[PDB]
Amino acid sequence: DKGKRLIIKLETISEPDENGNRTIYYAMNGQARRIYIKDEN
């Protein structure tokens, strides 16, 4: 918006776990923040 706005920084990604999900290490608006993603390979 006008004067809002996201700031994203990607730290790393982890090699998949046993459910084949990877861990993204994010920083968004001054909070560490992690998200899960099933790989497709």
Partner: protein
């Protein structure tokens, strides 16, 4: 009349205002330098705007015009200057009003009154308050050393209107330093000498005025523990002040302010030796350490500032101040700032990414967030202040304890902090007693008996790490083979 508010500041005090304003259902707007791109206070308002893609972070929060420009762009009804940038500057307050914005503060004449150390000397005397005897005005025209000499009293000093000087012509020739100092950091460049009042307690009083002529004080803060220039620890109220002494100072506080019709929050600073007190300065604004006072009184000082700026009356249903005799302290509270000033190394601000971060909480404990959170990068550009920590209890002992233990329970990794130093202070017999004066740090060399603490954890993380990446000698370098369990009889 205040629907939306901008904060011409950064860091903890911005974050404090945003929260006040939040609670008043007032919408909040933040500004930031190029170097504050990723700084916590930016994210803590509703809106936030860069000041100038082209303005040096040094000077990005003092550019009167661009701040107001950013303000008008967004229907700001009020700006809160915070402390220590454009907070005491009439030009800014003048330019605010003209553009139809409400500067949350005292009146222009309260700013000009006090911006000068000389202007504010006269004011104090002409309201019948004690003053520190000194060069009746400043001086310029040189050899300005040789004169005030032998006419006042032994202890002296050179201060510099907004060093010791024990004479023996250590005056003309410790008059070499002045060209690069009170030109660059101070306001209007001027200089005037003062009787050095030895071994003083440093006590300040919190005052609040509405725009209707009602003033109150919220008692005294004890700001005696300081290391050189700056304040290290504050305690409210002063543990080591007699009942009457506390009165007389509080009466004077309110005699000065009643007398020049003060408005909003300001602070009267005094210097205290034995049973005499003297007027130092006024601070026409909120101070860092106001937290202490909120804790022992219950009054919300910042919320109140805003509300006074909106024309609310002290005794009205909305600010709701107790009549004076009902304003009371209940217990003692203490403050200290977690910074990255490294104790072991000449107190450098340190600079980096915070990897791990953990605060405190529970009884008596209040954290005012600053620059510091898990993600953050700290920069060399503004004064490091990771967290303001304040604690509070019926007793001063319980208060302090409560403080060491949340200094000790804290965990900040990636930068060095003043925590080891602060812990030593809170711990010290001298502080615990309450009787301390401003030479507390001079007189205590134990205080810098910092020693880098062992930690079983980090070391262990650093071995495991090594071996995982670069293996162990003679041992066929290979992923850690999977072994059989086999349970240990016992």
């Amino acid at each position: 009349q205040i629907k939306k508010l901008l904060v011409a500041n950064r860091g903890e005090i911005a974050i404090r205002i945003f929260r006040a304003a939040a609670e008043l259902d007032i919408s909040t707007v933040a500004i930031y330098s190029n170097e504050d791109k990723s700084s916590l206070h930016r994210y803590k308002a509703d809106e936030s705007y860069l000041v100038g893609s082209d303005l040096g972070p040094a000077e990005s929060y003092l550019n009167i015009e661009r701040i107001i420009d950013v303000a008008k762009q967004a229907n700001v009804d009020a700006i809160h200057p915070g402390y220590g940038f454009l907070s005491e500057n009439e030009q800014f307050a003048r330019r605010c009003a003209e553009e139809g914005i409400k500067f949350i503060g005292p009146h222009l004449e309260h700013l000009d009154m006090f911006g000068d150390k000389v202007k504010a000397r006269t004011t104090a005397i002409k309201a019948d308050l004690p003053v520190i005897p000194g060069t009746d005005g400043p001086i310029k025209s040189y050899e300005l050393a040789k004169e005030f000499a032998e006419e006042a009293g032994f202890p002296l000093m050179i201060k510099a209107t907004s060093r010791i000087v024990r004479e023996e012509s250590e005056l003309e020739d410790a008059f070499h330093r002045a060209k690069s100092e009170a030109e660059k950091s101070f306001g209007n460049s001027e200089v005037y000498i003062e009787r050095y009042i030895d071994n003083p307690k440093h006590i300040e009083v919190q005052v609040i005025g509405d725009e209707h002529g009602n003033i109150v004080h919220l008692f005294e803060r004890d700001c005696s523990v300081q290391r050189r220039h700056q304040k290290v620890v504050e305690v409210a109220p002063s543990v080591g002040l007699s009942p009457t002494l506390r009165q007389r100072i509080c009466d004077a506080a309110i005699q000065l302010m009643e007398n020049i019709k003060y408005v909003n929050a300001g602070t009267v600073e005094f210097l205290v030796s034995g049973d005499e007190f003297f007027f130092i300065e006024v601070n026409p604004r909120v101070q860092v350490e106001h937290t202490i006072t909120e804790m022992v009184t219950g009054i919300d000082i910042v919320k109140t500032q805003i509300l006074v700026a909106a024309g609310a009356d002290l005794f009205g249903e909305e600010i709701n101040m107790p009549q004076q005799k009902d304003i009371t302290t209940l217990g003692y509270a203490i403050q200290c700032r977690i910074t990255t000033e490294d104790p072991l190394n000449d107190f450098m601000p340190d600079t980096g990414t915070i990897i791990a971060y953990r605060s405190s909480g529970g009884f008596g404990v209040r954290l005012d967030a600053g620059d510091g959170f898990q993600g953050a990068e700290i920069s060399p550009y503004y004064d490091s202040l990771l967290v303001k920590l304040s604690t509070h209890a019926i007793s001063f002992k319980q208060a302090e304890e409560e403080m060491v233990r949340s200094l000790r329970e804290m965990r900040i990794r990636g930068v060095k902090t003043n925590i080891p130093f602060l812990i030593n202070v809170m711990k010290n017999k001298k502080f615990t007693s309450g009787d301390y004066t401003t030479k507390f740090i001079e007189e205590t060399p134990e205080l810098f008996d910092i020693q880098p603490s062992l930690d079983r954890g980090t070391k262990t993380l650093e071995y495991i790490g090594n071996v995982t990446i670069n293996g162990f000698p003679n041992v066929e370098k290979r992923p850690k083979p999977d072994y059989e369990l086999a349970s240990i009889p016992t």
